[PDB]
Write a protein that binds this ligand. Structure first.
Ligand SMILES: [Cl-]
Ligand SMILES: [Cl-]
Lengths: 750, 745
């Protein structure tokens, strides 16, 4: 096919090639009817299709063709289930084929640096391994149906405030280990047809014209074979952008930037090979979509609704379950309290907003699962229409809670709190909802709180409640999934993909979010998410990877393939997980790697593997993990490559980042050695660390150290520490030759 | 006028020789012109003059002098008068030993609890540090000798202190690290300032012209000279041009030969050299005029002062069930190796050979009297054992109260290296836990120069923090333990629960000759307050044997300008039965500001003595600097118009009274807009908004977008949108260039 692609570009005029690198309208590429090049359509989004209708204004974001609204990424990621996410991706692909969409503008895979980021609900995790794995699964599913996925937003689009002008200042190592890392394996393992650049600047340059970002990292290093699309209106200098690696500008600019491409080529400022390479990347995707186009495609809207119900039920997180209040008994009286019972929160706002084909009713689904023997009572409790206080609602809700055997309060973040375009300003539930939970907990000790929200929230009442069910934004089948888990038809198996801090101010980005004067600096560096709380010793409300189950899982017999391993070697880790309870369920096994000693500062531990296993009561199965070099390597900026510092590494396997149950030690070694360059201002102790250089300076230093009667093995003496901190030039001040020192420095480097 | 006439008579070799030392402690004399040689020596909390018949490397073999409490403990007095008196006692001892310049005080900010020299620094707060440093300098120089402020600047770690590149943003320097030295220079005018060993943003402090000339000599108007740290000079000519006047110690003419060669070559102007010589000579002859021949000081009175300084700066961190003060009856058990070998000073160039030394056991027995049965048990050994623990448990159970003396051994804290952890030795922790099991009434006295973790804090009733109390520590401990002195010390630095909590933890001591202060302003309590992290004991915390009730907070004005001044008043009443001193603390909070600044910052403190039932009024004056942050754009202190809270309390976390104030400025910063400026930012300038409003109004209505909906995506897209994107939302590029011209004009 590629031989035919080159033949088509030879037949295209310069104006036709430059027009292809820009959109036709808001969602379509320009056709070339002369050569049979068709026009393809791309649209949102990550957790559901949002195709705008024909007779709709461009700003009418929600006026779209009905499609399945799946759980958003923030909740779906809590499944830790690569298979479940791929199936949701395949369902999205099926719906694209049915609606003649060639490219889905998803998934979103930006790192959750701050809990306040407005789009956290449609992102996966604060961890680059969990994010990349689930993003790769999402892409594989979408593209298994013959349509393209668009990974976004590349990169470091971690706040909505000033996202179109802010200069994001991130050091290289933090990028390689955290923000680039979230996208890296999604590109490498899933090979998405398109990657979308971000609105923001990264270290002085907009991502749409950042050649290091788009060409050096994405296209050359990671070998991205598809094309790169801009975010909508993210193009600044089109010619600079095309040379940097931005292939397709969206939306259309009505030929303004197209004429700039043609004039720059004819002027000689822009090589035509740059244009041909971008056209070739775009045409490859266009014809790959045409090749996989399914005529008269249909999907089963009811089957996708049941999938959305399963996806939500298997990603809900049981944060707390004191006295095993959940699952609810199918008897007695159950009280449902909250405005979210009738008007539930199930998705976010912005370009990802979905017009659902259906929407489950929470009260009816629970009543259906409860049965005849259950008496179901509802009380409004609080009102979303007014952020005020209404003691009549609180008093009526307390009376309903007292008469019942159990009270279930549905609370969380209203629709206005979370959206694309702006961030949250605080991390707390509306006060009228907090007053209700505390009031219900006073009169009914058996109180369950169901949280509907796209991002972490503070829970000041956490000690007054028995059960907290975190459903995130569960999609259009939230009601059924809630009924399934609350009554135990589904054993909850979701575990958090991001840290829930006690206070917003605890979070690592707090002092540097959202920045000042079109500038934000990631001064926390690597220490994002649980990496911060673990290393700082700060206890979150609920840690990364936390999630309970109606059953208990016992870990035992941790195995390792090897104990002494090299950089180019591979270790195999094994653990046996047994369901020691009475109810079947799925357990998310988590593997972390700890570097006990390293010259560079690294987090306490980093997630490097996760699997989900289903276990019947009493059943035991073995779970396996493979450990790459990348499981032990940090990014070394000097050699511009991943490096493993020789030392001991702990393989931590547990039920959460703070529930490690088994550990094993391994020793990983490297043949790579970093060469340090010394000067006349280099510390004496640093030069004596290189045995080659120590042979040159050791004897000379011995003459001065004994003449000064200084002990150098006394690690608690000032003069010993002065000799260690001394620059080499100060040694000549005792007894040497200035020129002789320069020769010794040359020999040390040689 | 006579100084300039002397410089005309000096040869070029003599001018270059004066800018470098004669030996380790003396300047070069010029006998031809009557220029004498003056001596400088350590240190901040006591005189350490090396003896004549002493080896050159024998750091501790010095003339006996009074060892006062080090700065870390002395700062907990919060008493400018007490610190100045200690400075004056230091000056008298310099005069007695013919020392013209004391190499003190040290005033570097406590960024990390692990810094090795924290024991001889004042505080983590630049206001408390600058005020007490100014008091120390005033005291020393009231006696006719010079003080040497050190170390300038940002010398906040001992690891690689001679090669590390310290990376600090401008605003953090101006508000925290420079600020610790600023008012000490301005209010006390020390004769000498010492540069630090480290690099500050790429340049050694010894040749950092922005540091020594632009900030210290030009902006702050330092009229004395600048001396290098010992061996901190790199390129002598560069340093002389940068503002480094005196290189110490001597280099035996090596750098002197570089200065003469650089002047004769024409690379270095002689006016630069003459200006440095004039700064050195001005101080030399100012010392000669104030030289007191054959001066003697009262060694006993300075010992009592060192006892008073320690007793008034010990911090009662905890006192559950009022175990302290101890009763003068029953049986009291003193446990710990620190009973016989107490920790009372640090290690390094500031180490003092004391003229006297109180014995903890004898002073306590003396203060206890006939009715007290005093029993001793060793408990633990510093040299390395359950026998010591078992004997100590029987002694604690047999007693009515047990007092354990614990802390950091001498090897832990010194100049030259930092601490690696923040806990007292484990054999001491095991002992405290064992004694707390069998004796519930347990008092822990801590001897240490820097914060320590206290995992046993819930097992003990009283914790008395004595820091490094000096040569009269034993008497001062007896004074406070039995209530002869009502303790009034309050922490000058935050005591974290865990080392990892502290702001510098992820960036200390750095890597590869580089450390970056990525926490910025948020050092000390500024970090814990804004982050909501609970310290073990907060900044400004300290208990008393009596209680003080605050009331009637008054304020001079409620609406004030940038150039105005506010006067704050508060009434403090001793509502207890015992007289005592209370440290009143004033903080300023900026409730809303465009720049990120801490939750609150200390801007005033006073200490008042109150007899039982007595009430006195405490007054504060609030400068422009009390509300201003450092604005890097205008390179000046700036006050954003808004509301400010005046917080008065007994500690940084015990605010008792508050008052609201509104501070305004007529100074307005002009922002320059481009085609890449956000629409919302351009609408912030009412002049420029008048240019863009109409054009933006057409686009907003054509798209049916509500712009008063602060929770809508499309409204937020218009706000974040660059002006160039407006053409994409329908406009003309050429009209946009004209609109940008009108906005800037
Ligand atoms: Cl990212
Ligand atoms: Cl400093």
């Amino acid at each position: 096919m590629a031989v035919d692609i080159k033949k088509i570009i030879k037949q295209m005029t310069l104006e036709e090639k430059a027009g292809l690198c820009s959109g036709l309208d808001f969602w379509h590429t320009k056709p070339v009817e002369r050569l049979g090049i068709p026009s393809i359509m791309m649209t949102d989004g990550p957790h559901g299709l949002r195709k705008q209708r024909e007779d709709a204004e461009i700003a009418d974001i929600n006026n779209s063709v009905p499609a399945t609204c799946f759980p958003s990424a923030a909740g779906l990621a809590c499944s830790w289930d690569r298979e479940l996410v791929e199936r949701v991706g395949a369902a999205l692909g099926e719906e694209c084929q049915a609606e003649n969409v060639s490219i889905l503008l998803g998934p979103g895979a930006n790192i959750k640096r701050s809990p306040l980021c407005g789009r956290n609900f449609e992102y996966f995790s604060e961890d680059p391994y969990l994010s990349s794995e689930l993003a790769a699964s999402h892409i594989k599913g979408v593209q298994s149906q013959g349509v393209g996925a668009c990974l976004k937003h590349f990169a470091a689009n971690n706040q909505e405030h000033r996202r179109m002008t802010v200069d994001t200042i991130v050091d290289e190592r933090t990028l390689r280990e955290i923000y680039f890392a979230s996208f890296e394996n999604a590109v490498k393992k899933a090979r998405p047809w398109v990657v979308m650049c971000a609105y923001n600047k990264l270290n002085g340059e907009y991502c749409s014209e950042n050649r290091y970002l788009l060409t050096e990292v994405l296209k050359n290093e990671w070998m991205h074979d598809g094309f790169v699309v801009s975010d909508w209106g993210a193009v600044n200098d089109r010619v600079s952008g095309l040379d940097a690696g931005l292939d397709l500008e969206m939306p259309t600019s009505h030929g303004i930037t197209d004429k700039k491409i043609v004039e720059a080529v004819k002027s000689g400022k822009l090589s035509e090979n740059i244009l041909n390479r971008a056209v070739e990347r775009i045409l490859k995707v266009i014809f790959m979509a045409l090749e996989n186009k399914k005529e008269n495609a249909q999907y089963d809207k009811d089957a996708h609704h049941r999938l959305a119900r399963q996806a939500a039920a298997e990603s809900m997180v049981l944060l707390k379950n004191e006295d095993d209040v959940l699952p609810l008994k199918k008897s007695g009286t159950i009280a449902l309290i909250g405005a979210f019972v009738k008007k539930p929160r199930y998705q976010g706002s912005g370009s990802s907003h979905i017009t659902p084909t259906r929407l489950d009713d929470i009260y009816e689904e629970i009543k259906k699962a409860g049965g005849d023997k259950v008496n179901l009572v509802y009380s409004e409790g609080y009102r979303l229409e007014n952020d005020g206080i209404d003691e009549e609602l609180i008093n009526e809700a307390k009376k309903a809670a007292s008469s019942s055997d159990v009270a279930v309060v549905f609370a969380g973040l209203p629709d206005e709190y979370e959206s694309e375009g702006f961030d949250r300003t605080h991390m707390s539930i509306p006060e009228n909802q907090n007053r209700l939970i505390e009031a219900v907990a006073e009169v009914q000790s058996n109180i369950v709180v169901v949280l509907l929200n796209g991002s972490p929230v503070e829970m000041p009442w956490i000690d007054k409640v028995k059960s907290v069910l975190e459903a995130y934004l569960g999609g259009q089948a939230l009601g059924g999934a809630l009924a399934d888990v609350l009554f135990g038809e589904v054993n909850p198996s979701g575990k958090l993909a991001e840290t829930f801090p006690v206070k917003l101010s605890h979070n690592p980005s707090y002092l540097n979010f959202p920045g000042e004067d079109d500038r934000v600096e990631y001064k926390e560096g690597l220490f994002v998410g649980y990496r911060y709380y673990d290393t700082k010793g700060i206890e979150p409300l609920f840690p990364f990877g936390h999630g309970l189950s109606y059953t208990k899982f016992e870990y035992s017999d941790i195995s390792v393939d090897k104990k002494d391993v090299s950089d180019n070697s591979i270790i195999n880790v094994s653990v046996k997980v047994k369901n020691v309870g009475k109810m079947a369920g799925k357990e998310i096994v988590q593997l972390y790697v700890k570097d006990v000693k390293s010259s560079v500062r690294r987090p306490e531990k980093e997630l490097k593997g996760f699997e989900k296993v289903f276990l019947n009561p009493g059943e035991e199965k073995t779970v396996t993990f493979t450990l790459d070099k990348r499981a032990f390597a940090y990014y070394n900026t000097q050699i511009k490559d991943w490096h493993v510092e020789s030392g001991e590494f702990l393989i931590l396997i547990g039920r959460s980042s703070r529930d490690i149950v088994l550990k094993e030690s391994v020793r990983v070694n490297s043949t790579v050695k970093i060469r340090k360059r010394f000067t006349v201002n280099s510390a004496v102790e640093d030069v004596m660390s290189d045995s080659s250089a120590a042979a040159v300076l050791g004897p000379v230093l011995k003459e001065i150290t004994d003449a000064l009667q200084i002990d150098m093995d006394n690690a608690h003496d000032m003069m010993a520490a002065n000799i260690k901190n001394m620059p080499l030039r100060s040694l000549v001040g005792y007894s040497q030759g200035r020129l002789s020192e320069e020769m010794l420095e040359e020999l040390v480097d040689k």
